[PDB]
Amino acid sequence: MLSGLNHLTLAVSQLAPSVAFYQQLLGMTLHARWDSGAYLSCGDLWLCLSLDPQRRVTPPEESDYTHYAFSISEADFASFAARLEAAGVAVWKLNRSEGASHYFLDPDGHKLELHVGSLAQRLAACREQPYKGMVFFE
Amino acid sequence: MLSGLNHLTLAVSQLAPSVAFYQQLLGMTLHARWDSGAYLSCGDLWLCLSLDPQRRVTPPEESDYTHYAFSISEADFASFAARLEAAGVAVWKLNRSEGASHYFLDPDGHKLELHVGSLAQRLAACREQPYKGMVFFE
Ligand SMILES: [Mn+2]
Ligand SMILES: [Mn+2]
To answer: For a disulfide at B113, which of A7, A126, B69, B91, Cβ 3.0-4.6 Å?
Structure first.
């Protein structure tokens, strides 16, 4: 039986700028790097960056909605989002609202998100303002 | 400061076969569904399936190494992999490293993995037998 996410592996086209993005700008902890990868953590999350010459930098309009959201507190959300905008990090657009979120791209065009709130809080919000056709299983 | 992974969103081409795969085959808990998505959990992982007309069923040779690994115990690993094999789930890679991994595809070609073991266990192995160019940060 599955118990959660073991690790997230992102393919990257150039290792050094990606390590710098996740460690220096997003503040994740760097544990190890080698010629073809790096291991970082973000709380409980094990993040692996893997050098892949097949990774292309894709515009957000021609990639699908697959994306990765990181937790941040209400108190830090706005100041962190402002730091990203000031550093020139690019943005993307989702088709729907899902609460307090900031959407941004990594250097290879992976779609990232800062989000405030848990699944339980999301479900409670949706009971009041549901998506079209929403059904709940309790 | 970021405190971990908040949610993982996968773009899907058809909602019903993807719900069947994650809920029934993989055993995740379905919390809600709407006309264009679903919310599931797997342990502490919040998974969102988002219906996206841009999502292509993508062969594994046409996508990069980006992938998502789920936690499982060693005791459960072999029987879970056999279940996937009975259901006809395709494998995209053989495990060639130490530690138990099974690499399988979802119905849209998202690259998934079953893995036994933590980041700390991987770092311990790498300290004994480091990869080419490996540097550690304490
Ligand atoms: Mn999201
Ligand atoms: Mn992996």
So the answer is: B69
- B53 C-alpha vs ligand 1 centroid, how far in Å? 17
Domain-wise residue ranges, chain B: 1-138
In this structure, chain A runs to a length of 138
Superfamily of the domain at B1-138: 2,3-Dihydroxybiphenyl 1,2-Dioxygenase, domain 1 (3.10.180.10)
CA B48/CA B68 separation, integer angstroms: 13
Q: What is the C-alpha separation between A50 and B1, in angstroms, rounded?
A: 24
**B102 assigned to a ligand binding site:** no
Give A82 Cα–ligand 2 centroid separation in angstroms. 32
